[PDB]
Amino acid sequence: PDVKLEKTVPRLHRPSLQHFREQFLVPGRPVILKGVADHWPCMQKWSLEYIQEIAGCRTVPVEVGSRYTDEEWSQTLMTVNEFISKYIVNEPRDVGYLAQHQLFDQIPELKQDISIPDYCSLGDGEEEEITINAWFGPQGTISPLHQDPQQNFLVQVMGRKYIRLYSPQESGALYPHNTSQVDVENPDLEKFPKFAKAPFLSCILSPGEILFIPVKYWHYVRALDLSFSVSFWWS
Numbered sequence: 001p002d003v004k005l006e007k008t009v010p011r012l013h014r015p016s017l018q019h020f021r022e023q024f025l026v027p028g029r030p031v032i033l034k035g036v037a038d039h040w041p042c043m044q045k046w047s048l049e050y051i052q053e054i055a056g057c058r059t060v061p062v063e064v065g066s067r068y069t070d071e072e073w074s075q076t077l078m079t080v081n082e083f084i085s086k087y088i089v090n091e092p093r094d095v096g097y098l099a100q101h102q103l104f105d106q107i108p109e110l111k112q113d114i115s116i117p118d119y120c121s122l123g124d125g126e127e128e129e130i131t132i133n134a135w136f137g138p139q140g141t142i143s144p145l146h147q148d149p150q151q152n153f154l155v156q157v158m159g160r161k162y163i164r165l166y167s168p169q170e171s172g173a174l175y176p177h178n179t180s181q182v183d184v185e186n187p188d189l190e191k192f193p194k195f196a197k198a199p200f201l202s203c204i205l206s207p208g209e210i211l212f213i214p215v216k217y218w219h220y221v222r223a224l225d226l227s228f229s230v231s232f233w234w235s
Protein backbone atom coordinates (compact mmCIF):
# COMPACT_ATOMS: atom_id res chain seq x y z
CA PRO A 1 0.00 0.00 0.00
CA ASP A 2 1.00 3.64 -0.64
CA VAL A 3 2.62 4.88 2.57
CA LYS A 4 4.61 7.69 0.92
CA LEU A 5 1.23 9.39 0.47
CA GLU A 6 0.27 9.07 4.14
CA LYS A 7 1.61 10.57 7.33
CA THR A 8 4.18 8.08 8.52
CA VAL A 9 5.16 7.10 12.06
CA PRO A 10 8.48 8.70 13.11
CA ARG A 11 11.43 6.27 13.34
CA LEU A 12 14.27 6.65 15.81
CA HIS A 13 17.46 4.66 16.28
CA ARG A 14 17.89 3.89 19.99
CA PRO A 15 16.43 7.07 21.47
CA SER A 16 17.46 7.63 25.08
CA LEU A 17 14.94 6.66 27.81
CA GLN A 18 14.56 10.31 28.73
CA HIS A 19 13.74 11.43 25.18
CA PHE A 20 11.22 8.59 24.92
CA ARG A 21 9.50 9.33 28.21
CA GLU A 22 9.18 13.01 27.51
CA GLN A 23 8.41 13.14 23.77
CA PHE A 24 6.40 9.98 23.32
CA LEU A 25 5.30 8.06 26.41
CA VAL A 26 3.87 10.96 28.43
CA PRO A 27 2.23 12.81 25.47
CA GLY A 28 1.18 9.47 24.02
CA ARG A 29 2.79 9.86 20.61
CA PRO A 30 3.70 6.79 18.53
CA VAL A 31 7.27 6.14 17.48
CA ILE A 32 9.20 3.37 15.83
CA LEU A 33 12.26 2.17 17.76
CA LYS A 34 15.16 1.05 15.55
CA GLY A 35 18.26 -0.96 16.48
CA VAL A 36 16.87 -2.15 19.80
CA ALA A 37 15.37 -5.55 19.03
CA ASP A 38 17.08 -6.26 15.71
CA HIS A 39 19.88 -8.36 17.27
CA TRP A 40 17.52 -10.37 19.51
CA PRO A 41 18.12 -14.09 18.83
CA CYS A 42 14.52 -14.49 17.62
CA MET A 43 15.44 -12.52 14.54
CA GLN A 44 17.89 -15.12 13.14
CA LYS A 45 16.63 -18.13 15.01
CA TRP A 46 12.93 -18.24 14.13
CA SER A 47 12.31 -19.80 10.76
CA LEU A 48 9.01 -21.45 10.01
CA GLU A 49 10.83 -24.78 10.49
CA TYR A 50 12.49 -23.72 13.72
CA ILE A 51 9.06 -23.02 15.30
CA GLN A 52 7.54 -26.11 13.72
CA GLU A 53 10.16 -28.29 15.40
CA ILE A 54 10.21 -26.90 18.91
CA ALA A 55 6.56 -25.84 19.17
CA GLY A 56 4.97 -28.09 16.57
CA CYS A 57 3.48 -30.41 19.17
CA ARG A 58 1.84 -27.88 21.57
CA THR A 59 -1.90 -27.09 21.50
CA VAL A 60 -2.79 -23.50 20.62
CA PRO A 61 -5.95 -21.34 20.11
CA VAL A 62 -6.67 -20.37 16.48
CA GLU A 63 -8.82 -17.48 15.24
CA VAL A 64 -10.99 -18.16 12.21
CA GLY A 65 -12.63 -14.95 11.02
CA SER A 66 -12.11 -11.27 11.77
CA ARG A 67 -13.03 -9.59 15.06
CA TYR A 68 -15.73 -7.01 14.21
CA THR A 69 -18.43 -8.55 16.42
CA ASP A 70 -18.26 -11.27 19.09
CA GLU A 71 -20.48 -13.53 16.95
CA GLU A 72 -18.25 -12.85 13.97
CA TRP A 73 -15.24 -14.86 15.14
CA SER A 74 -14.47 -18.23 16.69
CA GLN A 75 -11.50 -20.11 18.16
CA THR A 76 -10.27 -23.70 17.85
CA LEU A 77 -7.68 -25.70 19.77
CA MET A 78 -5.11 -27.52 17.61
CA THR A 79 -1.34 -28.15 17.55
CA VAL A 80 1.18 -25.74 16.02
CA ASN A 81 1.68 -28.52 13.48
CA GLU A 82 -1.99 -28.74 12.53
CA PHE A 83 -2.14 -24.97 12.38
CA ILE A 84 0.94 -24.53 10.23
CA SER A 85 -0.39 -27.30 8.04
CA LYS A 86 -3.97 -26.11 7.55
CA TYR A 87 -3.39 -22.32 7.28
CA ILE A 88 0.17 -21.62 6.09
CA VAL A 89 1.91 -24.21 3.93
CA ASN A 90 1.05 -24.98 0.32
CA GLU A 91 -2.22 -23.35 -0.72
CA PRO A 92 -4.33 -22.46 2.36
CA ARG A 93 -7.80 -21.47 1.25
CA ASP A 94 -9.33 -19.90 4.35
CA VAL A 95 -7.45 -17.59 6.68
CA GLY A 96 -6.68 -18.53 10.28
CA TYR A 97 -4.61 -16.61 12.83
CA LEU A 98 -2.57 -17.45 15.92
CA ALA A 99 -3.35 -14.23 17.72
CA GLN A 100 -2.99 -12.90 21.24
CA HIS A 101 -1.70 -16.16 22.76
CA GLN A 102 0.89 -16.35 25.50
CA LEU A 103 3.32 -18.80 23.91
CA PHE A 104 6.20 -17.80 26.17
CA ASP A 105 4.55 -19.06 29.33
CA GLN A 106 3.52 -22.20 27.56
CA ILE A 107 7.11 -22.60 26.38
CA PRO A 108 9.53 -20.72 28.70
CA GLU A 109 12.46 -21.75 26.49
CA LEU A 110 11.46 -19.28 23.78
CA LYS A 111 11.84 -16.48 26.36
CA GLN A 112 15.58 -16.59 25.76
CA ASP A 113 15.06 -15.47 22.14
CA ILE A 114 13.41 -12.17 23.21
CA SER A 115 13.95 -9.48 25.83
CA ILE A 116 11.84 -7.03 27.80
CA PRO A 117 12.59 -3.62 26.25
CA ASP A 118 14.32 -1.18 28.64
CA TYR A 119 11.68 1.44 27.84
CA CYS A 120 9.18 -0.52 29.92
CA SER A 121 10.76 0.45 33.24
CA LEU A 122 9.52 4.02 32.68
CA GLY A 123 6.07 2.67 33.46
CA ASP A 124 4.55 2.31 36.94
CA GLY A 125 3.88 -1.46 36.75
CA GLU A 126 6.11 -4.47 37.59
CA GLU A 127 7.93 -6.61 35.01
CA GLU A 128 6.07 -9.67 36.25
CA GLU A 129 2.64 -8.34 35.22
CA ILE A 130 3.76 -7.54 31.66
CA THR A 131 1.67 -9.57 29.16
CA ILE A 132 3.65 -10.94 26.19
CA ASN A 133 1.63 -12.25 23.25
CA ALA A 134 2.49 -14.07 20.04
CA TRP A 135 0.83 -13.23 16.75
CA PHE A 136 1.57 -15.78 14.07
CA GLY A 137 -0.45 -16.02 10.88
CA PRO A 138 -0.30 -16.05 7.06
CA GLN A 139 -0.28 -13.05 4.72
CA GLY A 140 -3.72 -11.38 4.69
CA THR A 141 -4.59 -11.43 8.36
CA ILE A 142 -6.55 -8.43 9.55
CA SER A 143 -6.94 -7.22 13.13
CA PRO A 144 -9.64 -4.47 12.88
CA LEU A 145 -9.29 -0.92 14.21
CA HIS A 146 -9.42 -1.00 18.03
CA GLN A 147 -7.72 0.22 21.24
CA ASP A 148 -6.09 -1.68 24.11
CA PRO A 149 -6.15 -0.79 27.82
CA GLN A 150 -2.32 -0.73 28.02
CA GLN A 151 0.85 0.67 26.47
CA ASN A 152 2.19 -1.55 23.70
CA PHE A 153 5.53 -2.56 22.26
CA LEU A 154 4.81 -4.56 19.13
CA VAL A 155 7.94 -6.31 17.83
CA GLN A 156 8.06 -7.62 14.27
CA VAL A 157 10.10 -10.82 13.88
CA MET A 158 9.17 -12.37 10.55
CA GLY A 159 7.46 -10.65 7.63
CA ARG A 160 5.98 -7.15 7.34
CA LYS A 161 2.77 -5.60 8.64
CA TYR A 162 0.88 -2.49 7.48
CA ILE A 163 -0.35 -0.58 10.52
CA ARG A 164 -2.56 2.52 10.79
CA LEU A 165 -2.94 4.74 13.83
CA TYR A 166 -5.63 7.21 14.93
CA SER A 167 -5.24 9.03 18.24
CA PRO A 168 -7.80 8.70 21.03
CA GLN A 169 -8.87 12.34 20.66
CA GLU A 170 -10.22 11.11 17.31
CA SER A 171 -12.74 8.48 18.46
CA GLY A 172 -15.70 10.43 17.08
CA ALA A 173 -14.93 9.87 13.42
CA LEU A 174 -14.31 6.19 14.04
CA TYR A 175 -17.74 5.06 15.23
CA PRO A 176 -17.17 2.65 18.14
CA HIS A 177 -19.53 -0.34 18.48
CA ASN A 178 -13.48 -0.72 22.45
CA THR A 179 -13.60 -1.35 18.70
CA SER A 180 -14.64 0.46 15.50
CA GLN A 181 -17.43 -0.39 13.06
CA VAL A 182 -15.41 1.07 10.20
CA ASP A 183 -13.46 -1.06 7.75
CA VAL A 184 -10.25 0.94 7.45
CA GLU A 185 -9.31 -0.25 3.94
CA ASN A 186 -12.82 -0.48 2.46
CA PRO A 187 -14.98 2.10 4.33
CA ASP A 188 -18.73 2.81 3.92
CA LEU A 189 -18.35 6.55 3.25
CA GLU A 190 -22.06 7.12 3.80
CA LYS A 191 -22.78 4.84 6.78
CA PHE A 192 -19.74 6.65 8.23
CA PRO A 193 -19.43 10.26 6.93
CA LYS A 194 -16.92 11.63 9.52
CA PHE A 195 -14.13 9.11 8.84
CA ALA A 196 -12.58 9.99 5.48
CA LYS A 197 -10.93 13.10 6.89
CA ALA A 198 -9.70 11.87 10.31
CA PRO A 199 -5.92 12.36 10.70
CA PHE A 200 -3.72 9.31 11.17
CA LEU A 201 -0.15 8.03 11.16
CA SER A 202 0.75 4.82 9.31
CA CYS A 203 3.65 2.47 8.71
CA ILE A 204 5.01 -0.69 7.22
CA LEU A 205 6.66 -2.53 10.15
CA SER A 206 9.64 -4.74 9.22
CA PRO A 207 11.71 -7.39 11.03
CA GLY A 208 13.83 -5.94 13.84
CA GLU A 209 11.57 -2.94 14.41
CA ILE A 210 9.42 -2.07 17.45
CA LEU A 211 6.25 -0.03 17.19
CA PHE A 212 5.34 1.79 20.41
CA ILE A 213 1.51 1.96 20.44
CA PRO A 214 0.38 4.35 23.21
CA VAL A 215 -2.39 3.25 25.62
CA LYS A 216 -5.87 3.47 24.04
CA TYR A 217 -4.41 4.62 20.71
CA TRP A 218 -6.53 3.11 17.85
CA HIS A 219 -4.73 0.67 15.55
CA TYR A 220 -5.50 -1.56 12.64
CA VAL A 221 -3.22 -4.32 11.34
CA ARG A 222 -2.87 -6.19 8.05
CA ALA A 223 0.01 -8.62 7.54
CA LEU A 224 1.86 -8.32 4.22
CA ASP A 225 3.66 -11.72 4.24
CA LEU A 226 3.89 -14.77 6.47
CA SER A 227 4.14 -13.02 9.81
CA PHE A 228 5.28 -13.43 13.36
CA SER A 229 4.96 -10.66 15.93
CA VAL A 230 5.44 -10.32 19.65
CA SER A 231 3.57 -7.75 21.71
CA PHE A 232 4.40 -6.48 25.19
CA TRP A 233 1.44 -5.01 27.10
CA TRP A 234 2.76 -2.83 29.90
CA SER A 235 1.89 -0.01 32.28
Ligand SMILES: O=C(O)CNC(=O)C(=O)O
Pocket residue numbers: 135141142143148152154219221222229231
Ligand atom coordinates in the same frame (compact mmCIF):
# COMPACT_ATOMS: atom_id res chain seq x y z
O1 LIG B 1 -0.62 -8.08 15.20
C1 LIG B 1 -1.86 -7.91 14.96
O2 LIG B 1 -2.43 -8.39 13.94
C2 LIG B 1 -2.67 -7.16 15.96
N1 LIG B 1 -1.94 -6.78 17.13
C3 LIG B 1 -2.54 -5.87 18.05
O3 LIG B 1 -3.71 -5.54 17.96
C4 LIG B 1 -1.76 -5.59 19.28
O4 LIG B 1 -0.58 -6.02 19.40
O5 LIG B 1 -2.12 -4.62 19.99
Ligand code: NI
Pocket residue numbers: 146147148
Ligand atom coordinates in the same frame (compact mmCIF):
# COMPACT_ATOMS: atom_id res chain seq x y z
NI1 NI C 1 -4.34 -4.67 19.97
